[PDB]
């Protein structure tokens, strides 16, 4: 009846099980289920995500195992929080994560049982790092053809959700379906430690080891790559001295520059690793 | 916005005296983001302040006074010899037209205080 | 039916390996586990019963479950050699009772003491007041040879609960030859 702008509060554990259950099935599409609690119409939260087993029927409404749901909810009853089920999700690793005919064929069953049952799709392929990726879907009611199809009010999260407008074939589903907004709730302490957990890559493994491993190598065979860098000095800069003369012939910039800029400045930043970490030897060797 | 108050009133965040207007600033800063809360668009009505020349002499009594403005009628158009204004319902006026207008010389009611800006001011019977 | 979780405790003390209870206390307490698991089965289907070894190191090999099949498997080849340890034997089953998923089941423990224990009266009265705070009702059945007309155990059951608490009952082996079924015949009819 009443419709208002919707927001999905997600837990980091939910997103982890999302992409983990979707990565283990690549290329094959898997089928999960969404877990959470319905607070009201205009706000919704997914506090947990669990994965359904893969069967021979493929992705289908029959793929959900009832005895698996009974034993899982029993295992959730002995777990700290036994919250009620909400909706379903299925990964689409092989393509642009659009709902198929079987996805709506199970959607009238999930909307039958559960009032909302928001459908979520996730794919690893789109971006390796800096995008939410995933997806969002909700089935609009076909019984609403009488009234208008264009809510909500407080368009803030709506008009901002539509953008990019998500291609054509995806927004070809904007007829009969509509997306839903996703925000990351904190839970700042865990988000901060898990932030540093992946920062162990580019910072250091222990925040000590890996750049003490930079104290292990430490110019060692690292001058071999300086010899290849000084071979990049000779190579790139012997054709860099041909550039300014040619600039005087053609008069002047061909736009350009060749770039052929910066580069070995970073090699000199490794020379800052040379001077610093070797200056540590005076502290290491003496007392 | 452009037609607010039938073009007779507008938003003023700075009074001529040099003090800031609290309900207009408060009105527009809560009006900043209307997307989150739609009714916030109604709070901008507080930012609307009347711009008019009020010829009220004192108390309830309303004198009949008309004074001259030196600007051309092209500036008076709101989609010369003398302007026709109230005589205080006051009449609308532009902040740029307040410096060119002059108190009536031959009228029975003349202001004791030099007339510069609009609003409600004293008008003395002479 | 009555809601509760009964934790049976077999007596693995070295004094329990004798055949005074025909044919042997191993099969005698096995039938004791048989009659307590089948009675609790005939009592309520929701009752889950595990086992715990009291003597030497206390370890529950069978997680609390309504099915006694794995319990009957552990009754064989149990190797009940060791010195009886009391104070830890009740608390180890108390921790197994705090792992129950459902909180509507009352905490209940049944144990068999067939050996003289070195547990001081101060330790059993500290466990008595601790069980008073934890509400746990323990029904003990004394087998084997021990102090004639056991006192510290009788005073343990007495001081364990009160008002009513209906209750903790102690069944001591009579000083005479009898079958194990005759010893457990009284508790199965009335606690
Ligand atoms: Zn599919």
Coordinates of C-alpha atoms in Angstrom, one line a residue, chain A residues 83-192:
Chain A
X83 CA 16.7 -13.8 13.2
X84 CA 14.0 -14.6 10.7
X85 CA 14.6 -15.0 7.0
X86 CA 13.9 -12.0 4.7
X87 CA 14.8 -12.5 1.0
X88 CA 17.0 -14.3 -1.5
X89 CA 20.1 -13.6 -3.6
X90 CA 21.9 -15.3 -6.4
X91 CA 25.4 -14.5 -7.9
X92 CA 26.0 -13.9 -11.6
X93 CA 29.7 -14.2 -12.2
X94 CA 29.6 -14.7 -15.9
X95 CA 27.7 -11.6 -17.1
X96 CA 26.2 -8.2 -16.1
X97 CA 24.2 -9.6 -13.3
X98 CA 20.7 -9.1 -14.7
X99 CA 17.6 -11.0 -13.5
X100 CA 16.6 -13.9 -15.8
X101 CA 13.3 -15.6 -16.4
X102 CA 13.9 -18.1 -13.5
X103 CA 14.8 -15.2 -11.2
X104 CA 11.3 -13.8 -11.5
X105 CA 9.8 -17.3 -11.6
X106 CA 11.1 -17.6 -8.0
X107 CA 10.3 -14.0 -7.3
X108 CA 6.5 -14.5 -7.2
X109 CA 7.1 -17.3 -4.7
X110 CA 9.4 -15.1 -2.5
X111 CA 6.9 -12.3 -2.7
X112 CA 4.1 -14.8 -1.9
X113 CA 5.7 -16.0 1.3
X114 CA 7.6 -12.9 2.3
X115 CA 6.2 -9.4 1.9
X116 CA 9.3 -7.8 0.5
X117 CA 12.1 -10.4 -0.3
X118 CA 14.6 -8.1 -1.9
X119 CA 16.6 -9.8 -4.6
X120 CA 20.4 -9.0 -4.7
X121 CA 23.0 -10.0 -7.3
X122 CA 26.8 -9.8 -6.9
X123 CA 29.6 -10.3 -9.4
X124 CA 33.4 -10.2 -8.8
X125 CA 34.3 -9.4 -12.4
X126 CA 33.2 -5.7 -12.9
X127 CA 35.8 -4.1 -10.6
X128 CA 38.8 -5.6 -8.8
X129 CA 39.0 -2.9 -6.1
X130 CA 37.2 0.4 -6.1
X131 CA 33.6 -0.2 -6.8
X132 CA 30.6 -1.5 -4.8
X133 CA 29.7 -3.6 -7.9
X134 CA 27.0 -6.0 -6.6
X135 CA 23.5 -5.1 -7.6
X136 CA 20.0 -4.6 -6.3
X137 CA 16.5 -5.6 -7.4
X138 CA 12.9 -5.5 -6.2
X139 CA 9.9 -6.7 -8.0
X140 CA 7.2 -4.1 -8.5
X141 CA 3.6 -5.3 -8.0
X142 CA 1.8 -6.0 -11.2
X143 CA -1.5 -5.5 -9.3
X144 CA -0.6 -1.8 -9.2
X145 CA -1.3 -1.2 -12.9
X146 CA -4.5 0.5 -11.8
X147 CA -2.7 3.2 -9.8
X148 CA 0.6 4.9 -10.8
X149 CA 3.9 3.1 -11.0
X150 CA 6.1 6.2 -10.0
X151 CA 6.7 6.5 -6.2
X152 CA 8.7 7.3 -4.0
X153 CA 8.8 10.5 -1.9
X154 CA 12.1 11.9 -0.5
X155 CA 13.7 11.2 -3.9
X156 CA 17.2 11.7 -2.4
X157 CA 18.4 8.1 -2.4
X158 CA 16.2 7.4 -5.4
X159 CA 17.5 9.9 -8.0
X160 CA 21.0 9.1 -6.7
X161 CA 20.4 5.4 -7.1
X162 CA 19.3 5.5 -10.7
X163 CA 22.6 7.0 -11.9
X164 CA 24.5 5.8 -13.9
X165 CA 21.1 4.6 -15.3
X166 CA 22.9 1.3 -15.4
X167 CA 23.2 0.5 -19.1
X168 CA 20.1 -0.6 -21.1
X169 CA 19.6 -4.3 -20.7
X170 CA 19.8 -3.8 -16.9
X171 CA 17.5 -0.8 -16.9
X172 CA 15.4 -2.8 -19.4
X173 CA 14.5 -4.5 -16.1
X174 CA 13.5 -1.1 -14.7
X175 CA 10.2 -2.0 -16.2
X176 CA 8.7 -4.6 -13.8
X177 CA 11.6 -4.2 -11.4
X178 CA 13.4 -1.4 -9.5
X179 CA 16.7 -1.2 -7.6
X180 CA 17.2 -0.4 -3.9
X181 CA 19.9 1.7 -2.2
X182 CA 22.8 0.2 -0.2
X183 CA 24.8 1.9 2.5
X184 CA 27.6 0.7 4.8
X185 CA 26.8 1.1 8.5
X186 CA 29.6 1.4 11.1
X187 CA 30.6 -0.7 13.1
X188 CA 33.7 1.6 12.7
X189 CA 36.1 -0.4 14.9
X190 CA 35.7 -3.6 12.8
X191 CA 35.7 -1.5 9.6
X192 CA 38.9 0.2 10.7

